[PDB]
Amino acid sequence: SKVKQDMPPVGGYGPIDYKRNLPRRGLSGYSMFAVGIGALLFGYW
Amino acid sequence: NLTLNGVLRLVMELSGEMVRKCDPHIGLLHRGTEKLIEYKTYLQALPYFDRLDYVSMMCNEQAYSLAVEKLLNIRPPPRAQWIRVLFGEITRLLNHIMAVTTHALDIGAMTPFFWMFEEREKMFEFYERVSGARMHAAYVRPGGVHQDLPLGLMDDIYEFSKNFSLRIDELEEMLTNNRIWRNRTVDIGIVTAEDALNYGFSGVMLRGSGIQWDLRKTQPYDVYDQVEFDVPIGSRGDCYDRYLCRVEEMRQSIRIISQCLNKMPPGEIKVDDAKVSPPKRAEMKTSMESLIHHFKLYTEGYQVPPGATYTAIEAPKGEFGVYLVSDGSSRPYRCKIKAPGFAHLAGLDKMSKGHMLADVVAIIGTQDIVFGEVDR
Amino acid sequence: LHHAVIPHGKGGRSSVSGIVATVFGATGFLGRYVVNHLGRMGSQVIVPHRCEPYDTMHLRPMGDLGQIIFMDWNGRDKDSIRRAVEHSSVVINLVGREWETQNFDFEDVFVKIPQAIAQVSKEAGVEKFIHISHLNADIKSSSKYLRSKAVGEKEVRETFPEATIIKPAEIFGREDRFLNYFANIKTVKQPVYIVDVTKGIINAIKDPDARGKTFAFVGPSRYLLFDLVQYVFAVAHRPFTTRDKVERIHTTDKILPHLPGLEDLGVEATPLELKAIEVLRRHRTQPAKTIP
Amino acid sequence: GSDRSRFLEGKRAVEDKNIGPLVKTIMTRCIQCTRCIRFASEIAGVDDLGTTGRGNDMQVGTYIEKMFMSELSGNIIDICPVGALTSKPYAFTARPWETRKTESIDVMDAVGSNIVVSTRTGEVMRILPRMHEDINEEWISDKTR
Amino acid sequence: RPTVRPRNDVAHKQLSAFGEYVAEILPKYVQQVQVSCFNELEICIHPDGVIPVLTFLRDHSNAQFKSLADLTAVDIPTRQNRFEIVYNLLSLRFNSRIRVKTYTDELTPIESSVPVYKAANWYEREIWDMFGVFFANHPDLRRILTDYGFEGHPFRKDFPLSGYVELRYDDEVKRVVAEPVELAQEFRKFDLNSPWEAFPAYRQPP
Amino acid sequence: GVRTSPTGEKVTHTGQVYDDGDYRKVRFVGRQKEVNENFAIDLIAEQPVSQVGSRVISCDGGGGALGHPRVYINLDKETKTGTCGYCGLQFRQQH
Amino acid sequence: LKKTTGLVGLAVCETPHERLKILYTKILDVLGHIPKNAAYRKYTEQITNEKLSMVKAEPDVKKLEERLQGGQIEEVILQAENELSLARKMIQWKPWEPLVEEPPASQWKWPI
Amino acid sequence: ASATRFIQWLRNWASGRDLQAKLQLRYQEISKRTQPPPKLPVGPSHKLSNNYYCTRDGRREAMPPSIVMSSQKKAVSPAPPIKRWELSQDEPYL
Amino acid sequence: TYKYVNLREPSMDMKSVTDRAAQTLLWTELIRGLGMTLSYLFREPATINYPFEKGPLSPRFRGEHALRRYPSGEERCIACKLCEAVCPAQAITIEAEPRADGSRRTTRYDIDMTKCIYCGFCQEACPVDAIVEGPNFEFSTETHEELLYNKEKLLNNGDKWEAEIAANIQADYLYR
Amino acid sequence: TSVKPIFSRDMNEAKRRVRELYRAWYREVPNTVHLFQLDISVKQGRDKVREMFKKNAHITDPRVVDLLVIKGKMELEETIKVWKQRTHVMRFFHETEAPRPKDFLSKFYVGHDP
Amino acid sequence: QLITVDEKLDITTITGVPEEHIKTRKARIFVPARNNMQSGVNNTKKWKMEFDTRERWENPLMGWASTADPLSNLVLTFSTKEDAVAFAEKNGWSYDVEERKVPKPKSKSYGANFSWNKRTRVSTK
Numbered sequence A: 001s002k003v004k005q006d007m008p009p010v011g012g013y014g015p016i017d018y019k020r021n022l023p024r025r026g027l028s029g030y031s032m033f034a035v036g037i038g039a040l041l042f043g044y045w
Numbered sequence B: 001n002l003t004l005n006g007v008l009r010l011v012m013e014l015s016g017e018m019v020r021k022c023d024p025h026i027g028l029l030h031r032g033t034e035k036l037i038e039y040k041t042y043l044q045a046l047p048y049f050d051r052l053d054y055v056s057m058m059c060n061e062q063a064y065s066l067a068v069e070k071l072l073n074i075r076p077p078p079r080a081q082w083i084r085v086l087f088g089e090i091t092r093l094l095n096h097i098m099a100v101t102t103h104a105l106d107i108g109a110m111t112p113f114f115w116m117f118e119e120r121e122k123m124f125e126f127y128e129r130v131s132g133a134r135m136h137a138a139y140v141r142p143g144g145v146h147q148d149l150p151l152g153l154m155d156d157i158y159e160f161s162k163n164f165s166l167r168i169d170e171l172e173e174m175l176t177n178n179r180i181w182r183n184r185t186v187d188i189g190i191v192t193a194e195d196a197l198n199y200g201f202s203g204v205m206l207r208g209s210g211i212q213w214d215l216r217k218t219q220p221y222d223v224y225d226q227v228e229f230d231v232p233i234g235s236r237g238d239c240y241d242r243y244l245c246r247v248e249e250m251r252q253s254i255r256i257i258s259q260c261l262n263k264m265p266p267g268e269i270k271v272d273d274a275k276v277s278p279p280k281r282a283e284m285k286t287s288m289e290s291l292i293h294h295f296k297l298y299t300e301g302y303q304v305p306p307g308a309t310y311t312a313i314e315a316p317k318g319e320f321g322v323y324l325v326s327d328g329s330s331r332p333y334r335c336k337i338k339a340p341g342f343a344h345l346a347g348l349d350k351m352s353k354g355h356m357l358a359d360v361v362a363i364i365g366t367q368d369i370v371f372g373e374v375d376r
Numbered sequence C: 001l002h003h004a005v006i007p008h009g010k011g012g013r014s015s016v017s018g019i020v021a022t023v024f025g026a027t028g029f030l031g032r033y034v035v036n037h038l039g040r041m042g043s044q045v046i047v048p049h050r051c052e053p054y055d056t057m058h059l060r061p062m063g064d065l066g067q068i069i070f071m072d073w074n075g076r077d078k079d080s081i082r083r084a085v086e087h088s089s090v091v092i093n094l095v096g097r098e099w100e101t102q103n104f105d106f107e108d109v110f111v112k113i114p115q116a117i118a119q120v121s122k123e124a125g126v127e128k129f130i131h132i133s134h135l136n137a138d139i140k141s142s143s144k145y146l147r148s149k150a151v152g153e154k155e156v157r158e159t160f161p162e163a164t165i166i167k168p169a170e171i172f173g174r175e176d177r178f179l180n181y182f183a184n185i186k187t188v189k190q191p192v193y194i195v196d197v198t199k200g201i202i203n204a205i206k207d208p209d210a211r212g213k214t215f216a217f218v219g220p221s222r223y224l225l226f227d228l229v230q231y232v233f234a235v236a237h238r239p240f241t242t243r244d245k246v247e248r249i250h251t252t253d254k255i256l257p258h259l260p261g262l263e264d265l266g267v268e269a270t271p272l273e274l275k276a277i278e279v280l281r282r283h284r285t286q287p288a289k290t291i292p
Numbered sequence D: 001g002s003d004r005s006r007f008l009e010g011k012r013a014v015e016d017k018n019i020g021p022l023v024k025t026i027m028t029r030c031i032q033c034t035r036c037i038r039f040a041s042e043i044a045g046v047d048d049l050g051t052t053g054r055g056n057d058m059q060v061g062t063y064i065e066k067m068f069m070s071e072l073s074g075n076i077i078d079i080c081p082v083g084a085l086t087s088k089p090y091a092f093t094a095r096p097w098e099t100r101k102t103e104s105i106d107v108m109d110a111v112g113s114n115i116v117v118s119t120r121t122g123e124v125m126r127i128l129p130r131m132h133e134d135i136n137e138e139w140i141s142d143k144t145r
Numbered sequence E: 001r002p003t004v005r006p007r008n009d010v011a012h013k014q015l016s017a018f019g020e021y022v023a024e025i026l027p028k029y030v031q032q033v034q035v036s037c038f039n040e041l042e043i044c045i046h047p048d049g050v051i052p053v054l055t056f057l058r059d060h061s062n063a064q065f066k067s068l069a070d071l072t073a074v075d076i077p078t079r080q081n082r083f084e085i086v087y088n089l090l091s092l093r094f095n096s097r098i099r100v101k102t103y104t105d106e107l108t109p110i111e112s113s114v115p116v117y118k119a120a121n122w123y124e125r126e127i128w129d130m131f132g133v134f135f136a137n138h139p140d141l142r143r144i145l146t147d148y149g150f151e152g153h154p155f156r157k158d159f160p161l162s163g164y165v166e167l168r169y170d171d172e173v174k175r176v177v178a179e180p181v182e183l184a185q186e187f188r189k190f191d192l193n194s195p196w197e198a199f200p201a202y203r204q205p206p
Numbered sequence F: 001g002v003r004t005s006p007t008g009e010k011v012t013h014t015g016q017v018y019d020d021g022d023y024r025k026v027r028f029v030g031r032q033k034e035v036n037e038n039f040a041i042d043l044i045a046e047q048p049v050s051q052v053g054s055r056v057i058s059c060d061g062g063g064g065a066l067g068h069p070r071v072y073i074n075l076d077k078e079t080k081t082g083t084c085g086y087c088g089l090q091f092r093q094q095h
Numbered sequence G: 001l002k003k004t005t006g007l008v009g010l011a012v013c014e015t016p017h018e019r020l021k022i023l024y025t026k027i028l029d030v031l032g033h034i035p036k037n038a039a040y041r042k043y044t045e046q047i048t049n050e051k052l053s054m055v056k057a058e059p060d061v062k063k064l065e066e067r068l069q070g071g072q073i074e075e076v077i078l079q080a081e082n083e084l085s086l087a088r089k090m091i092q093w094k095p096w097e098p099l100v101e102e103p104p105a106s107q108w109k110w111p112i
Numbered sequence H: 001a002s003a004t005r006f007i008q009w010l011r012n013w014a015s016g017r018d019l020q021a022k023l024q025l026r027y028q029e030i031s032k033r034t035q036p037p038p039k040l041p042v043g044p045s046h047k048l049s050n051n052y053y054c055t056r057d058g059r060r061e062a063m064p065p066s067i068v069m070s071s072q073k074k075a076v077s078p079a080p081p082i083k084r085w086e087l088s089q090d091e092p093y094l
Numbered sequence I: 001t002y003k004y005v006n007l008r009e010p011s012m013d014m015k016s017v018t019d020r021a022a023q024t025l026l027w028t029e030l031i032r033g034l035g036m037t038l039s040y041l042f043r044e045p046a047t048i049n050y051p052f053e054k055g056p057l058s059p060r061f062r063g064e065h066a067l068r069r070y071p072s073g074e075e076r077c078i079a080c081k082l083c084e085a086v087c088p089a090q091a092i093t094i095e096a097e098p099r100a101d102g103s104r105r106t107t108r109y110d111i112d113m114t115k116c117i118y119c120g121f122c123q124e125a126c127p128v129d130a131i132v133e134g135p136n137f138e139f140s141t142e143t144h145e146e147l148l149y150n151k152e153k154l155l156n157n158g159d160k161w162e163a164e165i166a167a168n169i170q171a172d173y174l175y176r
Numbered sequence J: 001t002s003v004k005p006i007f008s009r010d011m012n013e014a015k016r017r018v019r020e021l022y023r024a025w026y027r028e029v030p031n032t033v034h035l036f037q038l039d040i041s042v043k044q045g046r047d048k049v050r051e052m053f054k055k056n057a058h059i060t061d062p063r064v065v066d067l068l069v070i071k072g073k074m075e076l077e078e079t080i081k082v083w084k085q086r087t088h089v090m091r092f093f094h095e096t097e098a099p100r101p102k103d104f105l106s107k108f109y110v111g112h113d114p
Numbered sequence K: 001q002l003i004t005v006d007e008k009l010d011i012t013t014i015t016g017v018p019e020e021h022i023k024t025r026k027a028r029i030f031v032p033a034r035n036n037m038q039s040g041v042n043n044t045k046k047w048k049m050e051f052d053t054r055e056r057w058e059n060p061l062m063g064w065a066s067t068a069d070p071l072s073n074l075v076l077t078f079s080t081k082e083d084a085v086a087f088a089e090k091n092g093w094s095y096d097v098e099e100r101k102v103p104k105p106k107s108k109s110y111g112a113n114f115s116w117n118k119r120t121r122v123s124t125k
């Protein structure tokens, strides 16, 4: 009968990621300081 | 100067916080492997290599198999070569996970060890499925590999590979930009390019310092010349850059594994030369020649033409090689094992000059020391 | 000799000494040394024990694989004694307590139990029997400990006439209740070293002329109890218990010239001065005057 | 030789001959080299061994039932290149790679035949001749063996 | 031919040519140069040439063997000089390897190569420990692998596989003690060599 | 075919048993002597002789590649049966 | 001028051309003290002169590196220093002299 | 896979990743633990003719070392100088 | 081909300098690390409920040794000693003689399970599938002596486990 | 008969190194007995040192003497720097090895060894 | 510089071998006899050195063969008898040397199987 052994599927496997993926999150430094200082000024008031 | 006193005995001289001298005392795991190998046939000596760098089992097997195949003047069949590169890179993932996360755990960051050791457990399943052992597979042998992959294994390697880069990302989120991690590793254990060469360093200990060298590129073996991948290079030669190189090498290993899965060819898995590789069991039980050769390979073993070879691979920890001397019989005359960690640990004293006691832990971690191979 | 018990090897751990010994009381002070010397030369040792197996663990490394065998036993159960001795060529009795308990008085540990071991050993055909008595054993002693030792010493000699009876003085050593006893706080004492007593016991097993004899194991020097206790405090670097125990410590060590001693078994007695620091070093946080 | 077979047929099978209590015969293993026949006729001076039949069915033996009992008979075990003739006392007890060889002398007579004493794990397993051209050239007597 | 390792004649010639190159430049020390059929270049030198030959191979512009891959020894008792000292070097510039071999006996020191390669430090300690070869002018020659106080050099062919002493804990002295080795099962020596010659190409003239 | 000795110790299929004076049987006191009760010598004897119609038969022990190396057994003698050297099955040429 | 050599410990050279001319000239000066018919002198002069010619005949550093095939120009300078250091040692060792001693007869025979 | 929608959103937002696409735990996508039997191929020496061992015997083609000089012109290097590596175009810099 | 892991020049524009200042003072990257461990808190753990649940294994698994029989009950082992010869640890000790019925059988078959490296070479070398490494891995003992297997113990293991062993051999023999 | 020396060029120079080593060992014994808390006397420690030197008294090869001193210095370094533990120091005294018989009859009784 | 040393080469004091296993042993230097079960002569080319056989006893637990001889398995190989003798000398082992046994040349002749008047005529083939 026909040879049968472990092989990849016809057409191969789907693509595999490997590259580093660390997405960008958060606000700029300006906004972060603005929120912090705004919180301080509300607290003082 | 206050003097303090696998497993390691470090004798250190400290002036306050600074290490003034570091004298490693090893041999606590010396088991006379090289002498034992002289009383074994070439096949009988193979399992010893699983137990050297016992985190990179099939890479040690590959190094020994390549050395014997060189003296035998034979070559393994192409499918065996692709399997060997496939499991060589899976083994590099096993080592780099162990190296990075235990390096992290030793300095307080204990959580990545747990996430990544669930991945190690799934790779242990790939070893167990091809060889029946989770670690000391004795799978890669002179002539090729012991058995063909079971049906459905490659599909499961694809499934594991498809998700792994996300696990690396989670590891990087915990360490790469962490100011505490950087404080423990940046500018720690700086080694110059010329010092690294003269001290006999290899692998990431070289590339962390900018030296552009990787045996898989410069002196390729098996089918490494047929796969594409990049060599990560450091710029500062410190612990942080060697950490980044190891993380990037894991990513490139997944890149290579992807090509191995797609380019796996059909055919036999061990050299079709029954004077070297044993015949199939069905042949052994029907053919007179096959039974004779099975009988002789499993008692006397194959004779290896007299000669000597130094053979090296790019193991996960660095250049791993054997100087294998054949006297013409079926037992090796001498087997010297070149462990990359031997030279690396010999340079701990040089690397730790001007550093503090807690940095010595980081420097030992960045060298990636397993005392199975250091002591042999 | 049955083929299984012909000696072989060079007298090491993997050798075959040809001795098959049942050691009653092996989990005590003297027992741990006796079992060690038996297992050193590759003897088969049967260890009947009354205590938890956890408390016999220190004996396991003393012999090669299979050489130390453990059994349950009860001092009052003769069937459990028969199980332990019916394959042995020598039986050693080290059973004893320095105090009495609600369940076992001195007449039990030193008369009833030794007599039962001796009787069952006689019935089972055991060739050799070694029984530990005491130098100061005496039916008129003020100590109920020493009176029982005399009664039992006589019953063993009657029950198993060929028994080798050994009468040690106070034994000192790392786990003793002698030097340690003073360190934890009229009379002349002649204490003997634990290793000397052990070697005497081992050489009695081998010596055929030791059968049917009674030995007194004593140290090389005699000391006044006051001078000894003074020396203990000096060695322990320290500024210088039941009623029955106090009587024993104040009983002068008998001088029995007619009995053979350690020199009749090829054993040189170890002076206290050589070994005292070994025992007393852990107690730290001028040799004693000897009677001529 | 080559490392594989291309023989696709069925194999010959031959019945066994009883030639005494010393030499076991499994004659399907015989390769028809005729060493035993020549040794028996030339060295032992006994013409009881020969070939019967012809072609592929040619068989080595005595034709009739007969014991090959000679003071030198045990030597046909050594010269037979295959396991067709084997030592009956030695059967199944050891493999060659595991025995230790002690070169020694025979004392069963006054010829002083040179021998090898095969031992394993402290036990004597068999006796083999040791070549000494001026004594026993490479033979021993059945008593020595 | 699928099962036979292919030859590489280009590398064989290059290494042969460099072998002559080295031997022309250092005739004072080079005794033999050979290239194996799998293309490894071996320089055999007089032991006096260790420092000059290694320094030349490290520093010369057509050599630049900057990396000491390994340094080991082989014990061959039949030789007058039983110990063969083997240096395996790597040249990154020329992507090439070379092996340098010399010899010594029990009583003849070899010059330490720590001045050429700092990597040699521990390798020479290992050769001292396992083979008993003394290296002169070593910054710190002492055992590295064996237990403290260990007697003998285990990797010598005449050192027994299981050694002479074995350890155990002894309760009487309350410490680990060393005693002459006895084995419950002796190691079973196997005689595996076939009495028929395997490789005619290596037959030694009689 | 397990039997006990006069001491009551079971004899193994290899004929092993400690004799009366052997101290080594103390190892079994309070425990047991491991003995396999399925004696192969008796189990093979229970198999019937196979009647075949040729001078030579082959045996591979059954199961093809899961048995033993295939051997050919000569059945020329009517005095006894042909026995497989590997598995012990017996064969007889019919009439 | 490049920002870094890429190799830890190997600093950039501001004037590589003049540094190499000084070193190659120094090497040729030292090689003059070696006997004319020593292979080390003949070969080392040959390669040194080949590199010196390329240095004088190419003013652009990266074009020069492509011709020297020695990696970064700072690596070529270091290699020149290594050769100069070796040449001085060769004068003391005098390896051009005959073989000091023959080996024993079977010293290099393998297998035994 | 059994996490509620809210918990999936929570741990996705906390990690910054779509964790549900690449779960660490394996479910039905793995290979069945029972597979059809294989039928493995045979090597190139499985021939009935033109297959004499002396034509495919690697061990017997090994030779003793070639002796280029024994104790019985342009300069050369052991090999041509190694070529400069090229920067990756997949991702030159992390 | 190579890539640089850490060769980047931080931007010095004021917007970027302030971004790094906010990270230094507000600990933003430390907060990001907290999110990752938080996301794991709400992930399903990978733990299995041993001994009620078991880690998956393959038919090739190398566990406790056993000696097998033919379907008739005859031992498969013929005392060929190939297993003993190949054993890398010399863990196998065999003695043999003709059985009462003349069969070639062992009288001793010991495996020192504390010498064995569980490599499976013995079952590769066996020509009759007599010695196998079975699927059992839960046979830890309280004494060293209990791990010194003799033939009776190994035959009992074969009778105990044959049902599973045969099915595992059935699933993998076409790869051998 | 020309050979490469180790350190000494003749037995007179070799003997000077021996005496320096003996002096170093002799002076170190009191410290060793104290630091390692040995149960031997200083006299016993020095008697052992003298015994070890004496068994090598017959050597006439300066190279062999050189190696004996080299090994003696390494042994002293391990002791002085406390690389050895108490077990290593006490291995010179064979405290658990029962004396082997020496006369012919005693060796005849116990076994076959000469 | 080279010094002059005239004493016999002796390394017994620096090899670490215990005294009992130098002075009481007896090394045998010989060429192994051909295994008479086979015609191959390749195992008769080199000289060997083995030591005197010493006691093996049955282990009480398993019946395994125990030993206390550390040299029981030690077998060295030498190219010549002189090399083997030299190695034994410097190690202090007393030894016996057995001269190599060579099979002497035979006079073989197929035609003698059919002699007209001599006894070499064979009665069968």
Ligand SMILES: CCCCCCCCCCCCCCCCCC(=O)OC[C@H](COP(=O)(O)OCCN)OC(=O)CCCCCCCCCCCCCCCCC
Pocket (backbone or CB within 6 Å): A036, A037, A040, B179, I024, I025, I026, I027, I030, I031, I034
């Ligand atoms: C109108 C004008 C009003 C005037 C007032 C205006 C004031 C507002 C502006 C001030 C804002 C300052 C913020 C103060 C917080 C402390 C900042 C700080 O100290 O950070 C620096 C410190 C070290 O940073 P480093 O990277 O090592 O470099 C600096 C040295 N070269 O970094 C660190 O401390 C790292 C800490 C390491 C420990 C990490 C573990 C904690 C991580 C999670 C913490 C979550 C926060 C907890 C919240 C409190 C809960 C109650």
Ligand SMILES: NC(=O)C1=CN([C@@H]2O[C@H](COP(=O)(O)OP(=O)(O)OC[C@H]3O[C@@H](n4cnc5c(N)ncnc54)[C@H](OP(=O)(O)O)[C@@H]3O)[C@@H](O)[C@H]2O)C=CC1
Pocket (backbone or CB within 6 Å): C024, C025, C026, C027, C028, C029, C030, C031, C049, C050, C051, C074, C075, C093, C094, C095, C096, C097, C098, C104, C109, C132, C133, C134, C135, C167, C168, C169, C170, C171, C172, C177, C178
């Ligand atoms: N040590 C000395 O100074 C001297 C001692 N002797 C005698 O030497 C022998 C041993 O001395 P030593 O070893 O110091 O005594 P220990 O008390 O140290 O050990 C006594 C042993 O007897 C066993 N034992 C006690 N009572 C019983 C019981 N009722 N049933 C069963 N077993 C029991 C104990 O077992 P468990 O652990 O289960 O309690 C223990 O193993 C004793 O007979 C003692 O009288 C004689 C002269 C001097």
Ligand code: SF4
Pocket (backbone or CB within 6 Å): D029, D030, D031, D032, D033, D034, D035, D036, D037, D060, D079, D080, D081, D082, D084, D085
């Ligand atoms: S010697 Fe053996 S193989 Fe040759 S003919 Fe006689 S029985 Fe057959």
Ligand code: SF4
Pocket (backbone or CB within 6 Å): B292, D029, D081, D082, D083, D084
């Ligand atoms: S060992 Fe030799 S004689 Fe016996 S079956 Fe195999 S090839 Fe035939």
Ligand code: SF4
Pocket (backbone or CB within 6 Å): I083, I086, I087, I088, I089, I090, I091, I092, I111, I115, I116, I117, I118, I119, I120, I121, I122, I123, I133
């Ligand atoms: S598994 Fe390996 S080590 Fe264990 S008995 Fe089998 S061959 Fe020997």
Ligand code: SF4
Pocket (backbone or CB within 6 Å): I076, I077, I078, I079, I080, I081, I082, I083, I084, I094, I122, I125, I126, I127, I128, I129, I130, I131
């Ligand atoms: S188990 Fe198999 S390999 Fe081992 S002796 Fe028995 S038949 Fe031979």
Ligand SMILES: [K+]
Pocket (backbone or CB within 6 Å): D076, D077, D078, D079, D080, D081, D082, D083, D084, D085, D086
């Ligand atoms: K034969």
Ligand SMILES: [Zn+2]
Pocket (backbone or CB within 6 Å): F059, F060, F061, F068, F084, F085, F086, F087, F088, F089
């Ligand atoms: Zn069959």
